[PDB]
Design a protein around this ligand. Sequence first.
Ligand SMILES: [Ca+2]
Length: 122
Amino acid sequence: APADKPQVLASFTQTSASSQNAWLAANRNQSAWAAYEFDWSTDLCTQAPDNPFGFPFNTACARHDFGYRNYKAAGSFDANKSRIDSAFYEDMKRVCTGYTGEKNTACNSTAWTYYQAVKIFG
Ligand SMILES: [Ca+2]
């Protein structure tokens, strides 16, 4: 791997919207990143808590799998887990931003439930 792989990896897994956006753009052109041999696989929100209202969290689950799979392969999952879990929560709250009134509250409550599940069983 290239010697700046750790920096790149860190840049795609911060909690901010610009880090989420940098990752989406790279996910869209995986081929430009082949030299880095990242694991791009994802099972979306499989094995997550129930989502009766259908809030669309698949993109957030995807970036969360990217942080877990790639930090485990780098041998530094324990030291970075909690950031990846928090970035997951921030991605989900950015989804909930498009709902208002009670729906926002319901979205936020499902997002917290997802966050807590990875925080505890991750
Ligand atoms: Ca997953």
